[PDB]
């Protein structure tokens, strides 16, 4: 279980 990315750096 692992969620979708919404922010990056």
């Amino acid at each position: 279980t692992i969620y979708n990315t919404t922010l990056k750096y």
Partner: antibody
Framework: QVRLVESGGGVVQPGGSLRLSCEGS????????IHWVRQAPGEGLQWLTV????????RYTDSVKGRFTISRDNSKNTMSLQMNNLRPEDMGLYYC??????????????????WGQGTMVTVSS | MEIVLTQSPATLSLSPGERATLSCRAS??????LTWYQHKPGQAPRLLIF???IRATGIPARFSGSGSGTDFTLTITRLEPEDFAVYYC??????????FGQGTKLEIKR
């Protein structure tokens, strides 16, 4: 067994300062970014800041940049928050909250999958 | 700019056994990135539903999430006493800031 524990809250005077800590356990601390969310007495929830899994990125809400600085020490399952120039606006209960595992790259999911109970910040004269 | 979330109603008063229907309105599409948390007094807030419709682990089936874009619904079918709490919606489509709804309080009708 996944746990998060906050500490370091107390009472201070306006203009005073504070250092908050959040302690993770039950998981690979460095695998997730950590958030702080606050709840002012009789109010809802407000997001404040997050630090990335690796400790390289940090984001703050408008209201507190310049005042608060977030950091972490993955070697110790630990992050902290230095709060300066405390106002009445800052009074409330502070929760550390885990950013759900973004599969990844240099990511943040924005999902708060585990929250702590909170530590209290009181601002008074 | 930041998505303002609006929750309705502010207080919801029902009886155990009834169906509850809660709404969250975004100011602009959040796509499907909408989460719901349950919050009891002096307890740690808890993740219920993520991505509008996915039940998190441990969360029972009576909790249902639906919606897309700007209008979202949290439904609880056979209300039990422990479902009486405060429910918040949250968005992760456009951040920072992460943004929340003002909360809907679910109270026992008697």
């Amino acid at each position: 067994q996944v746990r998060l524990v906050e500490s370091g809250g107390g009472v201070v005077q306006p203009g005073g300062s504070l250092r908050l800590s959040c302690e993770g356990s039950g998981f690979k601390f460095g695998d997730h970014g950590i958030h702080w969310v606050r709840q002012a007495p009789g109010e809802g929830l407000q997001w404040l800041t997050v630090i990335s899994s690796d400790g390289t990125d940090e984001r703050y809400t408008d209201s507190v940049k310049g005042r608060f600085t977030i950091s972490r020490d993955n070697s110790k399952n630990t992050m902290s928050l230095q709060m300066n120039n405390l106002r009445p606006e800052d009074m409330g209960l502070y929760y550390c909250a885990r950013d759900g595992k973004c599969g990844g790259g240099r990511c943040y999911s924005g999902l708060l999958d585990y929250w702590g109970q909170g530590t209290m910040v009181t601002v008074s004269s | 700019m930041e998505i303002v979330l609006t929750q309705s109603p502010a207080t919801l008063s029902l009886s155990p056994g009834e169906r509850a229907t809660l709404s969250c309105r975004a100011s602009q599409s959040v796509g499907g990135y909408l989460t719901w948390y349950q919050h009891k007094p002096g307890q740690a807030p808890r993740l219920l539903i993520f991505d509008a419709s996915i039940r998190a682990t441990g969360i029972p089936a009576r909790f249902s999430g639906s919606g897309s874009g700007t209008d979202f619904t949290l439904t609880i079918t056979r209300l039990e006493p422990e479902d009486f709490a405060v429910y918040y919606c949250q968005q992760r489509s456009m951040w920072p800031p992460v943004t929340f709804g003002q909360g809907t309080k679910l109270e026992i009708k008697r």
